[PDB]
Design an enzyme around this catalytic site. Structure first.
Site, mmCIF file in Angstrom:
data_model
loop_
_atom_site.group_PDB
_atom_site.id
_atom_site.type_symbol
_atom_site.label_atom_id
_atom_site.label_comp_id
_atom_site.label_asym_id
_atom_site.label_seq_id
_atom_site.Cartn_x
_atom_site.Cartn_y
_atom_site.Cartn_z
ATOM 1 N N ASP A 35 0.820 -1.205 0.000
ATOM 2 C CA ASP A 35 0.000 0.000 0.000
ATOM 3 C C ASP A 35 0.859 1.262 0.000
ATOM 4 O O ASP A 35 1.341 1.687 1.057
ATOM 5 C CB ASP A 35 -0.905 -0.015 1.235
ATOM 6 C CG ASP A 35 -1.798 1.201 1.335
ATOM 7 O OD1 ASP A 35 -1.938 1.902 0.311
ATOM 8 O OD2 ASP A 35 -2.396 1.401 2.426
ATOM 9 N N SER A 199 -0.273 15.504 -12.215
ATOM 10 C CA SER A 199 -0.514 15.130 -13.598
ATOM 11 C C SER A 199 -0.716 16.385 -14.429
ATOM 12 O O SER A 199 -1.236 17.392 -13.947
ATOM 13 C CB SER A 199 -1.737 14.209 -13.681
ATOM 14 O OG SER A 199 -2.119 13.968 -15.017
#
Length: 330
Positions: A35, A199
């Site tokens: 994770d 992004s």
């Protein structure tokens, strides 16, 4: 040193991925959910409330000659999906894919929430975010990666998740055969303890690319792709009959649909998520309403590049002094 381990989807929807981990002496192998969105290595154990164990493999510290109670230490974690767990702490030897850390904090669950109990395939979590998020008190503990880092050939790990197929976590090296083209690296902020990056934009299907900064985290422990409501609406508007359902808890679409791809930007590069990756199947057994793999982050407080996004790429988690993230197509 290096390590290399195969990671395997838990079910036919790729709801999560499990990777075998050796703990203790002799080895006890547990299947952990790696994770990158948390920083605790915790396991179902011989200490877990019996009624909260349903099929998981447990770690039994008393059977490990290298286990030592970390006296006074406790842990308690709450995740973004509403789940939680807590317990006490041992140190023990932990190995992943041939890479060994001695003295790793292994957090033994005394209590786990219902969703953990109900998932027989996940024996615990192995956190790979920054150690600043680790919940052990009163002495915060380091992640497996943080402990291994100095011994690794290169201070990196990579995630290569499969679509309906196994994939690979590597530690300490970049497998140049595992991706196509070049790896594009992008800046990371560690201020919130996550692999947080920006992004450069998105496209829906064969549509034009929209240049826009989207701050979010690379999180292998979240299944879906959670993005701003504007972006998500633009995606689902291209699917006839798709709609956001408050009763279901997100966007649903007709199971008869063919889903468009979704592209996200990494610098000047582009990662394409095929439409099929965005199908999470009927909302309930036999339903013709299917659940979408791209969902709004509104109300989460952060955008999350979860498995739906990451499995479309070969992803480098570069833990050099100034961390960065790398993405390549594959």
């Amino acid at each position: 040193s290096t390590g290399s381990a195969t990671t395997t989807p838990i079910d036919s929807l790729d709801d999560a991925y499990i990777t075998p981990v050796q703990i203790g002496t002799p080895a006890q192998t547990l299947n952990l959910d790696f994770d990158t969105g948390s920083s605790d290595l915790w396991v179902f154990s011989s200490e877990t409330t019996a009624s909260e164990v349903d099929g998981q493999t447990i770690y039994t510290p008393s059977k490990s000659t290298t286990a030592k109670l970390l006296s006074g230490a406790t842990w308690s974690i709450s995740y973004g999906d509403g789940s939680s767990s807590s317990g006490d702490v041992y140190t023990d030897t932990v190995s992943v894919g041939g890479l060994t850390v001695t003295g790793q904090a292994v957090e033994s669950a005394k209590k786990v929430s219902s969703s953990f109990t109900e998932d027989s395939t996940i024996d615990g979590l192995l956190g790979l975010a920054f150690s600043t998020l680790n919940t052990v008190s009163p002495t915060q503990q380091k992640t497996f990666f943080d402990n291994a880092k100095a011994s690794l050939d290169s201070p990196v790990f990579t995630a290569d998740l499969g679509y309906h197929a196994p994939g690979t976590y590597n530690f300490g090296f970049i497998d140049t055969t595992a991706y196509t083209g070049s790896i594009t690296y992008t800046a990371v902020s560690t201020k919130q303890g996550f692999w947080e990056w920006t992004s450069t934009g998105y496209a829906v299907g064969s549509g034009t690319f929209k240049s826009t900064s989207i701050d979010g985290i690379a999180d292998t422990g979240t299944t879906l792709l959670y993005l701003p409501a504007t972006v998500v609406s633009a995606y689902w508007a291209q699917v006839s009959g798709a709609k956001s359902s408050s009763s279901v808890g997100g966007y649903v679409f007709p199971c008869s649909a063919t889903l468009p791809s979704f592209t996200f930007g990494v610098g000047s590069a582009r990662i394409v998520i095929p439409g099929d990756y965005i199908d999470f199947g009927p909302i309930s057994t036999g339903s013709s309403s299917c659940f979408g793999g791209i969902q709004s982050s509104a109300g989460i407080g952060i955008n999350i590049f979860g498995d739906v996004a990451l499995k479309a790429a070969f992803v480098v988690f570069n833990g050099a002094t100034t961390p960065t993230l790398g993405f390549a197509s594959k």
